[PDB]
Write a protein that binds this DNA or RNA. Structure first.
Ligand SMILES: [Zn+2]
Ligand SMILES: [Zn+2]
Ligand SMILES: [Zn+2]
Lengths: 46, 297, 78, 115, 152, 261, 48, 67
RNA sequence: UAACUAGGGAACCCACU
C-alpha cells in the first residue's frame, strides 16, 4: 500500500497513493523515480 | 537518459596513437575503445579468417567489459480503462506464467531487481467491457532472450495527462566468443576463443597479448596503417606520450618510429620473441606485438 | 525384361535407408543379426550391406510404364 | 547466456572419474590415459618425464578440444615394461624433483634473506 | 463443486443432466471445467475403463441398459444410448455398478551447497527434487537440487 | 629414467618480486611452474558482495567487479582457509572466508574517494595490500554529496584458473637460452636484435654458435607479485600446489589401476 | 536445448528415452514432449 | 569511467596510481617521468595510465536523483 | 484444491552478410 517515489528535481521522499497524479507535493515537479528495491542484491565480485 | 538501446563501455581509453583532429572531435573526452596489447600471430588456429583470440584473464579484469541499457515505456489510457497495478489470478484474465511478485503495489518493478525473459516489469490491467474475470492482462514483459537488472524506473505524466512510466534495464555484457571487435583500420572480427593468461603466448617480460589477430587479415587488405599504429603505440607507451598519426605528416615515418623503438630496447620493427603458453618453448618466428586500438562493436 | 540401370542410385539409397530405418524404429522384424546396434539408421545400413532389405523399388519410366527392382537385385554403391 | 561456469575447468562433476585407463589395440604395450579437469600444465610435465624414460617408446599428450577440459596421454613402452608403471614412475620422478626444487628454493630464500 | 452435461439447447437456459438423474434448468452465466480425457474408472469387476467405452448397467435403478462413456468422475460415469429417447440419450451411472462390454516458486533462495555455493537467486520453476534458480549475479538460470537451496 | 636434480640460484629478492634461476631441469617443468605461478596459486580475493546502498554513478556490478580485483594479504592464511565449496557451513564462516564491510557516506562539498582504506576486514591479517602498515590506496568509487556506498563483502580462497582476481602475480618474466644457442627462435637478421638481460656475449657477437647437443636448461625467472602474497611465498606455494596435483593424480591412478587389475 | 527431434520409442531405446523424459525440459539432455499412439501430446515443460 | 584496479594485460595494481599520476603531472613532470616514478615499467601498465580518461569526474557534476 | 497462451497491416530509416 505505501509507495515512495523520489522527485527528479528536489530529491524528496514522496508518499503518494495510486491513481493520483505524479506531482511533487512541495515543488510541483512531475517526474519522480522509484527507490531502490529492498530485496537481496548479491553479486559475485567477478 | 532513458534511451532505448544504449551501450556503455566500462573502461574506455583514449587512443595512444591519435590524429590531431580528435582534439576537436572530442574523442579524447568520450572515447570508444581500449588500447590493447595485440600480437599478430597464428596461435592454435582459432583466429583464422577474420577472427580474434582474446585473453580471458584480461576480460576477467574488466577488459572490454560493457553494460547494455534497454528502456521500456508504457502508458495507461482512458478510453476501457488501463491502470498500473499488480495483476491477480482471481481477478485478471490472460496472465502469463511469470513471477508477478516482482512487481510492487503500483504495478511497477523496482530498481535493483533481477529480471529474465518473459518477466513482467509493468503490470497493466484493462477492464472488460462486459464474473470470474473482470480485467484483462495487458502487462509488458522483457524481450524473450534478454536478462538483466532493473536500473531505473521513472514515472511521470505524458502529454495527454495520463500516467507514464519508463523502466531502464541494466545488462552487463562480458566479452565472449562471437562478440565483434574491430581495429581502427577496417579489421573487424569476432572472438574465436578466449585463453587464460597462462595459455596465451608471452614475451620475455611476461607480457601476454590481450587480442591475437591472424596474419592473413593483413596482406590482401593492405592495412599498413594498422602495423604503423601498432609500432607507434609501442613507441608511445614506452616513451610516455601520445603518438601523432595525422595522415599527411612528413615528420613521422616508419624509419623514425623504428629508431625510436630501437632506443627503448626493443627490436626496431616491433617483433618480439614469444614463448608458447602451453609448452614454454619459444616460437621460431618472432611475433609482431604492440598496443593498438580496438573497439567493441 | 528390365532396361533401367542395374546399379542402385544414391537417391534410391537415401529413400530406401530412410524407409527401412522408419520401419525398424516402428518395430519391423530385422532381417539381419544385431551386434548390440540400437540406432535404426545403422541397422538399416547393416541390412543394406547384406542385401536383406525387403523393399522393391518401382522405377517409373517416362512413357508411363514401371520396372520393379528388388534391393537385393541392385548393385550397392558401398 | 551459454557461458560455462569457471569452475568446470578444474572441478569434477558428480559421476566422472579423474583418470581412466584405455588399452591401445593397434600396437602392443600401449595405453591411453584420459585425465579429466586437467590441461597442458600437467600433461606437459608427464609427457616430458615419460620421454626421459628409455623404456618408453612413445609419449605424447593432447587436449582434444580447448573448450572441454580433458587431456589424453598416450604411452607406449617396451614389452618388458608397462605404460601404467611408466606413468607411475613419471609421476614419482616429477614429485621427487619438485620436492628437491622446493627445499633448494627454501635454502636459497634463507641464504638471500640472511645475505 | 459440481459438473454437468447439457442435454438440450434453449434460448436463455441450459438443460443439464448432472449426477442426480434429475434434469436441472440453469442460466447461461455456468462456468467451464477442463475435462479429464485420461481419467481412469473402475467397474464391478475392477476392470479399467476410459472415454468412449461401451459399458453395461447391471445394478442401480436403471439396470439392463447399455451406455458409452463421455465424461468421468471419482465415483460416477456419464452414459449415452442412441436408442434411449429421454433427454437426448444422456444418463449417469455409478462407476462400481457397471461392467465393461509449488511454494518455492518466486522465492529468493541461497545455494548453500555445491559448486554454486553462496549464489543468490529466485526460483523460476521447481519440482519435488530439482529447482530452476535464476541467478542474480549472472545471466544464467541453472538447475539446482532442492537439498542445496536455502530460502532467504 | 629418473628425476632431475634442479638447482636454484636467486639473484634478487624484494618485497615486490623474486628473480631466480632454475638449472638442470626440463623445459616442461619450468613452463608448468610458470603456469602454476599464474593460474594455480591460491590467494584470498573478494567473491561475494551484498550491496545494501549504492547511490554512486557506478552501478552495483561495476563496484563488485572493482572490489574483486582489490588484492588482499594472503600470507599464512590461505593455507588455513578451506575452499568455500569444500566447507560444510551454510553461509560463510571464518574457516573458509574473510568478511569485509564498507560503509561510506559523503556529506561534504568535496568529492569523497572511496578507497581500500574503507574496506574494513574482520580478520587482522587479510587486509588490502595498500592498507599494510608510502603507496596510495586503490580507488573504488568517487562520491559527491548525497551519495553513499554501503556493502558487505566476503573474501574467499581461489586460484587464477577460475578468475584472474585470484592471480597473485603481476608479471612472470620467463627466459631460457638468452644467446639462442639452441636456435629455438630463428632471427632473419640477428644483428638488429637487442641482447637479453641474461646474455653472456660481447658486443661484436649477435648470438651464440649453434649447439646440436643442447637442451633447454638454466631458466630465468622474475616473479613480480601483486602484493597478495610474498613472491617467495608465490613460488613455494606454486611448487607445493604442483606437487599436490601430481600426488592427487598418483592417488587416482593407483585406484584406477587397482580397480582395473 | 530448444530444438527437438521426435524419437520413436522402441524396446532398444526405452530406458534412454525414459531417463530423458525423467530429466524433462529443464535439464539440457532431456525432452520436451511425449507423443502417444493416438496423437495425444504430453508437455514435459509443465510437470505431469 | 574510472581508473581500472589492475592492468588488463598483466594484472599489476594501477588503481592506486591515478591520483599520484595526476599529482606528478601538475608537479611539472613529463608523462614518461611520471610513469617511471610510479614504478610502471612494462608498457602494458604504462598505457593503463597514459591512455586513461576519467569520465567519473564529469559524471559527478550531475546531482544524484536521491539525497 | 494447477481453471495453459503468443496476435495485425503499411511506409520509412539503419545495420548486416
Ligand atoms: Zn520535487
Ligand atoms: Zn566455511
Ligand atoms: Zn601490465
Amino acid at each position: 500500500q505505501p509507495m515512495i517515489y523520489i522527485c527528479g528535481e528536489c530529491h524528496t521522499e514522496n508518499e503518494i497513493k495510486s491513481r493520483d497524479p505524479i506531482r511533487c507535493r512541495e515543488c510541483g515537479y512531475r517526474i519522480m523515480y522509484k527507490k531502490r528495491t529492498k530485496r537481496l542484491v548479491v553479486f559475485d565480485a567477478r | 537518459r532513458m534511451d532505448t538501446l544504449a551501450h556503455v563501455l566500462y573502461y574506455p581509453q583514449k587512443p595512444l596513437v591519435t590524429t590531431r583532429s580528435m582534439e576537436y572531435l572530442r574523442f579524447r573526452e568520450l572515447p570508444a575503445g581500449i588500447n590493447s596489447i595485440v600480437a599478430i600471430a597464428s596461435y592454435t588456429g582459432y583466429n583464422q579468417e577474420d577472427s580474434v583470440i582474446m585473453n580471458r584473464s584480461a576480460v576477467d579484469r574488466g577488459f572490454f567489459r560493457s553494460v547494455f541499457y534497454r528502456s521500456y515505456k508504457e502508458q495507461e489510457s482512458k478510453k476501457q480503462e488501463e491502470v498500473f497495478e499488480k495483476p491477480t489470478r482471481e481477478t485478471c484474465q490472460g496472465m502469463r506464467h511469470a513471477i508477478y511478485d516482482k512487481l510492487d503495489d503500483d504495478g511497477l518493478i523496482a530498481p535493483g531487481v533481477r529480471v529474465s525473459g518473459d518477466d513482467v516489469i509493468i503490470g497493466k490491467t484493462v477492464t472488460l467491457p462486459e464474473r470470474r474475470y473482470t480485467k484483462r492482462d495487458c502487462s509488458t514483459f522483457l524481450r524473450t532472450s534478454e536478462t538483466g537488472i532493473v536500473d531505473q524506473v521513472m514515472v511521470t505524466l505524458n502529454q495527454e495527462g495520463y500516467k507514464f512510466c519508463k523502466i531502464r534495464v541494466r545488462s552487463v555484457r562480458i566479452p565472449q566468443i562471437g562478440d565483434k571487435f574491430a581495429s581502427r583500420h577496417g579489421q573487424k572480427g569476432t572472438c574465436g576463443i578466449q585463453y587464460r593468461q597462462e595459455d596465451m603466448p608471452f614475451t620475455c617480460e611476461g607480457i601476454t597479448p590481450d587480442i591475437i589477430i591472424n596474419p592473413h587479415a593483413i596482406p590482401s587488405r593492405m592495412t599498413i596503417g594498422h602495423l604503423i599504429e601498432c609500432l607507434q603505440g609501442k613507441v608511445s607507451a614506452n616513451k610516455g606520450e601520445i603518438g601523432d598519426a595525422t595522415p599527411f605528416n612528413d615528420a613521422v615515418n616508419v624509419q623514425k618510429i623504428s629508431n625510436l623503438l630501437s632506443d627503448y630496447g626493443y627490436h626496431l620493427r616491433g617483433n618480439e620473441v614469444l614463448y608458447n603458453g602451453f609448452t614454454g618453448r619459444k616460437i621460431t618466428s618472432q611475433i609482431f606485438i604492440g598496443p593498438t586500438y580496438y573497439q567493441r562493436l | 525384361k528390365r532396361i533401367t540401370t542395374p546399379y542402385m542410385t544414391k537417391y534410391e539409397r537415401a529413400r530406401v535407408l530412410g524407409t527401412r530405418a522408419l520401419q525398424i524404429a516402428m518395430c519391423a522384424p530385422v532381417m539381419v543379426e544385431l551386434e548390440g546396434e540400437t540406432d535404426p539408421l545403422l541397422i538399416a545400413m547393416k541390412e543394406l550391406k547384406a542385401r536383406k532389405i525387403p523393399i522393391i523399388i518401382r522405377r517409373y519410366l517416362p512413357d508411363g510404364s514401371y520396372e520393379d527392382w528388388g534391393v537385393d537385385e541392385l548393385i550397392i554403391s558401398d | 547466456m551459454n557461458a560455462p561456469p569457471a569452475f568446470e575447468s578444474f572441478l569434477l562433476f558428480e559421476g566422472e572419474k579423474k583418470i581412466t585407463i584405455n588399452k591401445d589395440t593397434k600396437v602392443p604395450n600401449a595405453c591411453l590415459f584420459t585425465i579429466n579437469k586437467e590441461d597442458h600444465t600437467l600433461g606437459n610435465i608427464i609427457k616430458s618425464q615419460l620421454l626421459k624414460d628409455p623404456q618408453v617408446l612413445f609419449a605424447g599428450y593432447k587436449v582434444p578440444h580447448p573448450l572441454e577440459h580433458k587431456i589424453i596421454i598416450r604411452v607406449q613402452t617396451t614389452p618388458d615394461y608397462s605404460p601404467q608403471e611408466a606413468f607411475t614412475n613419471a609421476i614419482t620422478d616429477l614429485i621427487s624433483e619438485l620436492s628437491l626444487l622446493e627445499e633448494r628454493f627454501r635454502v636459497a630464500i634463507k641464504d638471500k634473506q640472511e645475505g | 463443486q459440481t459438473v454437468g452435461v447439457i442435454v438440450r439447447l434453449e434460448r436463455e437456459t441450459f438443460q443439464v443432466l448432472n449426477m442426480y438423474g434429475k434434469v436441472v434448468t440453469v442460466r447461461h452465466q455456468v462456468t467451464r471445467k477442463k475435462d479429464n480425457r485420461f481419467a481412469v474408472a473402475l467397474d464391478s469387476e475392477q476392470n479399467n475403463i476410459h472415454v468412449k467405452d461401451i459399458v453395461k448397467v447391471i445394478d442401480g435403478p436403471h439396470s439392463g441398459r447399455e451406455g458409452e462413456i463421455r465424461h468421468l468422475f471419482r465415483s460416477f460415469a456419464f452414459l449415452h444410448c442412441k436408442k434411449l429417447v429421454e433427454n437426448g440419450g444422456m444418463f449417469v451411472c455409478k462407476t462400481r455398478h457397471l461392467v465393461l462390454a509449488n511454494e518455492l516458486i518466486g522465492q529468493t533462495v541461497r545455494i548453500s551447497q555445491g559448486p554454486y555455493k553462496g549464489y543468490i537467486g529466485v526460483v523460476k520453476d521447481a519440482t519435488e527434487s530439482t529447482a530452476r534458480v535464476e541467478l542474480h549475479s549472472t545471466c544464467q538460470t541453472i538447475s539446482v537440487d532442492r537439498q542445496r537451496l536455502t530460502t532467504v | 629414467p629418473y628425476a632431475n636434480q634442479p638447482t636454484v640460484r636467486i639473484t634478487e629478492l624484494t618485497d615486490e618480486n623474486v628473480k631466480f634461476i632454475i638449472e638442470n631441469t626440463d623445459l616442461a617443468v619450468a613452463n608448468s611452474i610458470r603456469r602454476v605461478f599464474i593460474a594455480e596459486v591460491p590467494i584470498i580475493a573478494i567473491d561475494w558482495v551484498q550491496i545494501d546502498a549504492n547511490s554512486s554513478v557506478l552501478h552495483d556490478e561495476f563496484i563488485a567487479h572493482r572490489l574483486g580485483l582489490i588484492p588482499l594479504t594472503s600470507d599464512d592464511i590461505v593455507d588455513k582457509l578451506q575452499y568455500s565449496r569444500d566447507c560444510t557451513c551454510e553461509e560463510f564462516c571464518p574457516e573458509c572466508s574473510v568478511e569485509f564491510t564498507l560503509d561510506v557516506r559523503c556529506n561534504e562539498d568535496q568529492t569523497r574517494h572511496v578507497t581500500s582504506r574503507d574496506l574494513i576486514s574482520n580478520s587482522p591479517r587479510v587486509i588490502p595490500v595498500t592498507s599494510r602498515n608510502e603507496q596510495d590506496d586503490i580507488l573504488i568509487v568517487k562520491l559527491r554529496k548525497g551519495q553513499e556506498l554501503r556493502l558487505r563483502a566476503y573474501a574467499k580462497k581461489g586460484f587464477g584458473k577460475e578468475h584472474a582476481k585470484w592471480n597473485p602475480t603481476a608479471g612472470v618474466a620467463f627466459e631460457y637460452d638468452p644467446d639462442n644457442a639452441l636456435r629455438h627462435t630463428v632471427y632473419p637478421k640477428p644483428e638488429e636484435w637487442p641482447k637479453s638481460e641474461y646474455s653472456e656475449l660481447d658486443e661484436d657477437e649477435s648470438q651464440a654458435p649453434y649447439d646440436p647437443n643442447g637442451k633447454p636448461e638454466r631458466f630465468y625467472y622474475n616473479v613480480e607479485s601483486c602484493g597478495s602474497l610474498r613472491p617467495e611465498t608465490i613460488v613455494l606455494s606454486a611448487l607445493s600446489g604442483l606437487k599436490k596435483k601430481l600426488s592427487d593424480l598418483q592417488t587416482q591412478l593407483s585406484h584406477e589401476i587397482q580397480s582395473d587389475v | 536445448a530448444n530444438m527437438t527431434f521426435a524419437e520413436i520409442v522402441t524396446p532398444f531405446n526405452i530406458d534412454r528415452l525414459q531417463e530423458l523424459v525423467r530429466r524433462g525440459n529443464s535439464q539440457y539432455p532431456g525432452a520436451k514432449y511425449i507423443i502417444r499412439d493416438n496423437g495425444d501430446r504430453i508437455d514435459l515443460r509443465f510437470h505431469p | 569511467m574510472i581508473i581500472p584496479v589492475r592492468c588488463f594485460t598483466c594484472g599489476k595494481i594501477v588503481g592506486n596510481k591515478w591520483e599520484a599520476y595526476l599529482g606528478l603531472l601538475q608537479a611539472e613532470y613529463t608523462e614518461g617521468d611520471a610513469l617511471d616514478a610510479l614504478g610502471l615499467k612494462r608498457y602494458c601498465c604504462r598505457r593503463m595510465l597514459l591512455a586513461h580518461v576519467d569520465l567519473i569526474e564529469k559524471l559527478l557534476n550531475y546531482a544524484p536523483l536521491e539525497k
